[PDB]
Design an enzyme around this catalytic site. Structure first.
Site, PDB file in Angstrom:
ATOM      1  N   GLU A  81      25.418  86.175  77.683  1.00  0.00           N
ATOM      2  CA  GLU A  81      26.374  85.875  78.711  1.00  0.00           C
ATOM      3  C   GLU A  81      25.845  86.370  80.075  1.00  0.00           C
ATOM      4  O   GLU A  81      26.622  86.530  81.009  1.00  0.00           O
ATOM      5  CB  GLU A  81      27.746  86.471  78.376  1.00  0.00           C
ATOM      6  N   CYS A 113      30.663  87.841  73.517  1.00  0.00           N
ATOM      7  CA  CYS A 113      29.938  88.719  72.579  1.00  0.00           C
ATOM      8  C   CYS A 113      29.791  88.167  71.178  1.00  0.00           C
ATOM      9  O   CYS A 113      29.107  88.761  70.347  1.00  0.00           O
ATOM     10  CB  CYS A 113      30.610  90.091  72.525  1.00  0.00           C
ATOM     11  N   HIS A 234      31.309  94.684  66.337  1.00  0.00           N
ATOM     12  CA  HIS A 234      31.127  94.594  67.761  1.00  0.00           C
ATOM     13  C   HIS A 234      31.818  95.823  68.355  1.00  0.00           C
ATOM     14  O   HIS A 234      32.980  96.077  68.069  1.00  0.00           O
ATOM     15  CB  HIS A 234      31.765  93.346  68.355  1.00  0.00           C
TER      16      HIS A 234
END
Lengths: 403, 403
Positions: A81, A113, A234
């Protein structure tokens, strides 16, 4: 059939900031970053970008391959990103500086993500398709935070994906996913980010529960405590992963607080060790957690690891695989810990100058010639190590140099 | 095993500009656009963006599906170089406004005009992986050119990909690809483009030849004239495709100019019909060429079509599949020709005001409330047709409306 990660390498920056220094200077309480489980963040120099990060993550994988095996890489997916162009993928520069075959599909993949996991799944499906037996794929998640401030790191993780998964053998078809449109966070402008932390948290938990439920419907008799020796997430920052694991355990198992905390320490804490030294590195964070889990947990017998991926916006996926003692030994030889300990440690003064200097390599820059001696001390830590750096941009063409 | 395009729908804008009007006003010679084979370009209104384009392309596919089949879509890939955020994929908005399942992988894919083909290949590999039998994928290539000027269009093409390929049955494993880092064109800034037309041309031809050679090495005894009843190309403008086909024929077959021109008319010209009415629509152009080939060529017996995809930067792929009479009949019922003829025809004055008005919806816009009555005439052509439009942006959140 077998498929997974054949090799995994990491690049965690050339420099970092101890967050206690930030707290103290920013007039916050020191128990804040402690409570959130943030210790350090990797910080990108102006002569580094997502391309140089990615190549440095991938270089050791490529160094080890025979020429024949190197030529078998027929897909390069860059997951990010922090893109540098609206159409040109970073994969083209990566191909160039690692010397890969011209007979190679190249593109970049975006979904905050979640990008890394999406790239890994596409690679997995390439091998499982059996359209080109012997083909490998190189998947690289790379992100930098070029200015929330305290949690935002820089790093990249490179995955070689093939039918000989020496590091992580994927449980095929064991996948659940979940997403929907939500404004939890987004990046509507270059070198910038917008979002609501409270809505971010709600959506992450909602996805953590529903992606797992979907996996459960597909994998009969699976158990959240018993089927997974470790869990990797994550990890925007550790405190939040602790919250999510607490929530899962409470709901799925009716577990009590003390039991929950022991389970956190045993199954989750090993994944957070490296994450606390780099900060949130976006799409690469889950893969760094995997690497951390492998180095810091117990692999004297094969183990199953449950993986939860999330990206704002939002989309998510829960999946799993197995690591053997052999795999763990190969991973230990990469020396991640030592790599991270050898990074230059920034003073607060150096760090603010770094922020000030970053405007020169903003998104859209047409021409710039980098001064490598901005911080002579940081340069000592890089020269001679075979690192790629950004040398210049000339009419939007980025030029890189091995140093 | 079987795999391919189950359904294909197109959206070619609500308005267009006849390029003869541009020529005349821009003081150029009228034989210029004629010589390049450009007739019209689709033009995007300010209350339209890549999301609204994509949803309008995909809506007819979704309208036809049973609820069960709609729920089988488990991947949405948006292919574009006109993104609206650095991390958030457009796929999340598309999912929302078409009403698709929350159990769905969602991401966006970038590599200039190669993006569509890359997305299609990932979808193909999902079905061929057999990780989730019955799963379908929705791949949408969507791009707008919001200000080279004369060739730059707006459009989207949506592909439903599955193991019942009613429209285009893919030749499995029949793929060649080729790319390398080159600065032919790029988009280093928002709502903008940089590049060299002469280097663009060289790279396109180099890839056209080498991607085909790779396919040839993989598909023994294939012949450039005899194995392909039609050819579809990424089509920046028709003149260039004519040049590339001429070059391939000269080199691969030692063909003479008159033979080459007859072969162009027979095998290539059918693909260019719709392309000349929309202009270059980036990653969606090859898929529009496929649709054009199908509607305008002869499918009284099954036919093989050779497909060449190219994206600046660069990467490329040559591949193939088959269309039956049944497939062609289903495709004819979509009414592409009539859709394109019913678009509003812009005057030069309307067109310059449109350009002037486009700044309000530039990349990075945080808040804007669109005036649908900017051009009352254009609105007559949209109201009542079940079109999605952009209503507003509020704190970067895009809101759309069925009208």
């Amino acid at each position: 059939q077998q498929v997974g990660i054949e090799a995994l390498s990491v690049y965690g920056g050339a420099a970092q900031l101890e967050l206690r220094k930030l707290a103290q200077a920013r007039q916050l309480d020191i128990s804040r970053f402690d409570n959130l489980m943030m210790k350090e963040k990797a910080v990108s120099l102006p002569y580094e970008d997502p391309v140089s990060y990615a190549v440095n993550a991938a270089k050791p994988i490529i160094d080890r391959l025979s020429d024949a095996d190197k030529q078998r890489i027929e897909m390069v997916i860059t997951c990010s990103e922090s893109g540098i162009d609206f159409g040109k993928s970073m994969s083209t520069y990566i191909q160039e500086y690692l010397g890969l075959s011209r007979n190679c599909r190249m593109f970049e993949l975006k979904q905050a993500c979640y990008s890394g996991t999406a790239g890994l799944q596409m690679a997995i499906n390439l091998i499982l398709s059996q359209t080109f037996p012997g083909a490998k794929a190189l998947v690289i998640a790379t992100d930098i935070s070029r200015f929330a401030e305290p949690s935002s790191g820089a790093g990249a993780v490179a995955l070689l994906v093939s039918d000989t998964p020496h590091i992580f053998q994927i449980d095929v078809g064991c996948n659940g996913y979940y997403g929907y449109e939500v404004m939890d966070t987004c990046r509507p402008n270059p070198d910038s980010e917008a979002g609501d932390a409270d809505l971010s948290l709600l959506s992450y938990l909602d996805c953590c529960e529903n992606a797992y439920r979907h996996y459960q419907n597909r994998v009969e008799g699976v158990d959240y405590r018993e089927s997974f020796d470790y869990l990797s997430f994550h990890t925007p920052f550790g405190g939040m992963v602790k919250g999510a694991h607490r929530n899962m355990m409470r709901r799925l198992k009716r577990a009590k607080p003390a039991e929950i905390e022991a389970d956190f320490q045993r199954r989750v804490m090993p994944g957070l060790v490296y994450c606390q030294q780099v900060g949130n590195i976006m799409g690469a964070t889950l893969f760094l957690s995997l690497a951390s889990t492998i180095d810091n947990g117990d692999f004297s017998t094969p183990r199953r690891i449950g993986m939860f991926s999330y990206g704002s916006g939002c989309c998510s996926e829960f999946y799993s695989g197995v690591v053997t003692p052999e795999g763990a030994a190969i991973a230990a030889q990469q020396g991640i810990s030592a790599q991270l300990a050898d990074r230059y440690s920034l003073s607060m003064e150096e760090y603010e100058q770094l922020l000030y200097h970053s405007s020169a390599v903003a998104f859209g820059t047409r021409n710039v010639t980098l001064d490598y001696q901005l911080f002579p001390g940081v340069w000592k830590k890089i020269a001679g190590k075979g690192r790629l750096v950004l040398k210049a941009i000339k009419e939007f063409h980025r030029k890189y140099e091995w140093v």
